[PDB]
Nucleic acid binder design. Structure first.
Ligand code: MG
Ligand code: MG
Ligand code: MG
Ligand code: MG
Ligand code: MG
Ligand code: MG
Ligand code: MG
Ligand code: MG
Ligand code: MG
Ligand code: MG
Ligand code: MG
Ligand code: MG
Lengths: 129, 51, 100, 55, 88, 218
RNA sequence: GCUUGAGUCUCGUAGAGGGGGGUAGAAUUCCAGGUGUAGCGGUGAAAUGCGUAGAGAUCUGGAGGAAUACCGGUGGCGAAGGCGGCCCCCUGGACGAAGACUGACGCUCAGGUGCGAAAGCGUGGGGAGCAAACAGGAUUAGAUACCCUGGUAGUCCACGCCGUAAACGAUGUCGACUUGGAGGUUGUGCCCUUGAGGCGUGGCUUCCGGAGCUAACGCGUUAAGUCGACCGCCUGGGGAGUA
């Protein structure tokens, strides 16, 4: 059931991508957005778009560089069944540094490079590379 | 079933019986009950009758 | 209130108790504020196979709108009455006229 | 089909013997083949049609 | 499964108006209606196991709905079960 | 823009999902390809095609079917171009090194047709050795001499030529090919939409390819 | 608070979905009688068995139980078990088309409760055919079998037990996402209905097949692919599903 949307996002992406699908949409939310943000701002998607009002609709434009998709792997990490939280010193780094980890902090949803520089930590929503 | 054959001829002309009864429902009802096993039978009668 | 087809068939040797019957069954349904959408005294008809010994028997068609109650006691009256050698009250879905 | 009383339209969906003719032969549609058989079974009961050709 | 006349009657006896059809109270009551009706169907028969399944489904549905109301508006809850006559 | 009078599209169901981007069809149980997206594929098509033909064109007009074999042993055959118009003896690229002597037997025989031994031995051996040569001729004509190693490859019917194309993909050979709606692209580097087994789209583009190798740098 | 998740409401549609009662023809066995006369029955071959008290064969009338040919179909319904003549009554679920109402009321679920083929048990019925047991006849080296002649429980009904099956898709439930192709079945919108149709749009179903997955076989939008929620369960064979 709907129960975990954020994985559903991570997934609708993962999938469409593997389906060399141009765009991809889904029910939106404060949260979906903030991540679609980091995802664009870190250059894993072209650009997002939320087209509705009562029943908002996040829409992401996918990217493809060579022939490949740009997003080579996108996984949940925290989840309803099992929440993950890391302190600053204990934040994770994906692919040695390449690619990134989305972490939500008391100062908003930012990357790991980010939250690290911000000197704090929070819930590690997902990994991406 | 019935042939009320008329005038000029002597041959049986009853190819009718190879269109229904006889070995039809007769070789059928003759023996082992069956029960759930005709299912397994007729399940091959379509696997076949697909092509 | 529902409808039904209904089509009892009667023994020849009771042929002219058919007017009395139809009279009666209709008096019975009308009585309970039910209509009667078709009626057809098909009379003596030949049988597709002999039933009960004897061939040919008198048919009667009907088409009623009546409550599950009079339609009940009809089916019985049909048993009680060993002059009706068959009967069959049927479907419904809205009245019907003409056919046959 | 639409009706069991239709012995005229009905008598061309059965063999000499009186056996219901399979849809495959008549090429009828599904939904209706049932409607058909029902209407036939009805007629057989009301002696409007032979179960058998044994008469 | 209950009449249009009957079901109507009760919407009109429990909601704001005919149309306020999905009002908690209403659902409960037209459920409660069918359950009770049924008690006699299963009085005779009793071996109608299959149909019985549907009836329980009615009870547990109603049960969850009753549970909802109570949490929401307790005031409305109590009135209901009184007026519907259950929860001994 | 268009030039293909009547090659429009072709091929009914049997369509390959991956061939959607070049389809605008839907005429009476059959796709018309996207005419207006094929021609931008003569651009690039005959371009890198020629861009190498002046760097020196070694080709292989590979295309078979007793229904366009001869129409390939044509000006397709004639120019800076080799060809195959019969059963693609599988491994003829990937095993050229074995096949290279299936050549030696062709020559060392016809070179000896009106020469060497010939009208001699027996008049059994005769046409009973020209059957050796006849056989060889088709499927191993166009090969004859391969002077400059097979360099690009131009194929009529992508998939019907499973093997040919495959070998190329394996040996790093450009493969230019036209692909009907039904066929699988991506085996083909330079892809050309539109019909691939009708007497026109052949000759047309086929003949038109002969026209760009046969002239690049005088 | 919100309306898309989930319900409620309206009119319809298909269905061997369940429960109860009624009823029909075909056959078998039996009883009675006509005609008729020496065999019938059975097997690989036999014999046991049946027939001169007249069998089998045929015809007519009658009794009774059990199951419903044809339709019939990788057809349909149900949670699973499983559900096929016809009719009425009672009743569960599913689906579709419009909009209207509720407003997260949801998913899952150890414990618990219910249901749950066949066989089997308890009291009473009921008993045509079938048939463990048992008897006879054969086969065989042996034959506690396979085959034959018989035939008891049982197989049927009511009431109540039992709670198991390769109870299997050997695939837990719910949700979202991801190329295609040919069928079957069932709703519904539009099109000179002017074709027995034309183009869409749901529910369910069979076959084939792409990525992907897999030890492989295979699965593949009805996943065994890609993800998440909760539950069940596995940790070498035998011992043992035993003590
Ligand atoms: Mg009898
Ligand atoms: Mg008799
Ligand atoms: Mg219903
Ligand atoms: Mg139980
Ligand atoms: Mg039992
Ligand atoms: Mg018993
Ligand atoms: Mg025995
Ligand atoms: Mg078990
Ligand atoms: Mg498959
Ligand atoms: Mg499909
Ligand atoms: Mg899954
Ligand atoms: Mg034990």
């Amino acid at each position: 059931s709907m129960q975990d949307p954020i994985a559903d996002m991570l997934t609708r992406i993962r999938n469409g991508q593997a389906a060399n699908k141009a765009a991809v949409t889904m029910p939106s939310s404060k949260l979906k957005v903030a991540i679609a943000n980091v995802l664009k701002e870190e250059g894993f998607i072209e650009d997002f778009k939320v087209e509705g009002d009562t029943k908002p609709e996040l829409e992401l434009t996918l990217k493809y560089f060579q022939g490949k998709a740009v997003v080579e792997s996108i996984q949940r990490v925290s989840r309803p069944g099992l929440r993950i939280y890391k302190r600053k010193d204990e934040l994770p780094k994906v692919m040695a540094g390449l690619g990134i980890a989305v972490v939500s902090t008391s100062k908003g949803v930012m990357t790991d490079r980010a939250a690290r520089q911000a000197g704090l930590g929070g819930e590690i929503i997902c990994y991406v590379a | 079933i019935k042939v009320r054959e008329n005038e000029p001829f002597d041959v049986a002309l009853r190819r009718f019986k190879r269109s229904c009864e006889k070995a039809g429902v007769l070789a059928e009802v003759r023996r082992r009950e069956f029960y759930e096993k005709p299912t397994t039978e007729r399940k091959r009668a379509k696997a076949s009758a697909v092509k | 209130m529902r409808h039904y087809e209904i089509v009892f068939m009667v023994h020849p040797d009771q042929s002219e108790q058919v007017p009395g019957m139809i009279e009666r069954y209709t008096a019975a349904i009308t009585g309970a504020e039910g209509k009667i959408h078709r009626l057809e005294d098909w009379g003596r008809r030949q049988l597709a196979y002999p039933i009960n010994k004897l061939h040919k028997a008198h048919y009667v068609l009907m088409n009623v709108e009546a409550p599950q109650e009079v339609i009940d006691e009809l089916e019985t009256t049909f048993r009680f009455n060993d002059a009706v050698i068959r009967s069959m009250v049927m479907r419904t879905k809205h009245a019907v006229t003409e056919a046959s | 089909e639409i009706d069991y009383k239709d012995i005229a339209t009905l008598k061309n969906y059965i063999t000499e013997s009186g056996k219901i003719v399979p849809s495959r032969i008549t090429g009828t549609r599904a939904k209706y083949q049932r409607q058909l058989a029902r209407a036939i079974k009805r007629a057989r009961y009301l002696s409007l049609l032979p179960y058998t050709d044994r008469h | 499964s209950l009449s249009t006349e009957a079901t109507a009657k009760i919407v009109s006896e429990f909601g704001r108006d005919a149309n306020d059809t999905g009002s908690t109270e209403v659902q409960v009551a037209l459920l409660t209606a069918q359950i009770n009706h049924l008690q006699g169907h299963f009085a005779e028969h009793k071996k109608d196991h299959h149909s019985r399944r549907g009836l329980l489904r009615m009870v547990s549905q109603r049960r969850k709905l009753l549970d909802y109301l109570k949490r929401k508006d307790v005031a409305r809850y109590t009135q209901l079960i009184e007026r519907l006559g259950l929860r001994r | 823009m268009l030039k293909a009078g009547v090659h429009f599209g072709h091929q009914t169901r049997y369509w390959n999902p991956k061939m959607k981007p070049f389809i605008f069809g839907a005429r009476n149980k059959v796709h018309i390809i996207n005419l207006e997206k094929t021609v931008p594929m003569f651009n690039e098509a005959l371009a890198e095609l020629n861009k190498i033909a002046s760097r020196k064109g070694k080709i292989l007009f590979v295309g078979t079917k007793r229904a366009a074999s001869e129409a390939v042993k044509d000006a397709a055959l004639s120019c800076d171009q080799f060809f195959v118009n019969h059963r693609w003896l599988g491994g003829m690229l990937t095993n050229w090194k074995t096949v290279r002597q299936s050549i030696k037997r062709l020559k060392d025989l016809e070179t000896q047709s009106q020469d060497g031994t010939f009208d001699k031995l027996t008049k059994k051996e005769a046409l009973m050795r020209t059957r050796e040569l006849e056989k060889l001729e088709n499927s191993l004509g166009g090969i004859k001499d391969m002077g400059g190693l097979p360099d690009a490859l131009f194929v009529i019917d992508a998939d019907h030529e499973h093997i040919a194309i495959k070998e190329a993909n394996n040996l790093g050979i450009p493969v230019f090919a036209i692909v009907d709606t039904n066929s699988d692209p991506d085996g083909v580097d330079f892809v050309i939409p539109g019909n691939d087994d009708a007497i026109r789209a052949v000759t047309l583009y086929l003949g038109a390819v002969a026209a760009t190798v046969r002239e690049g740098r005088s």
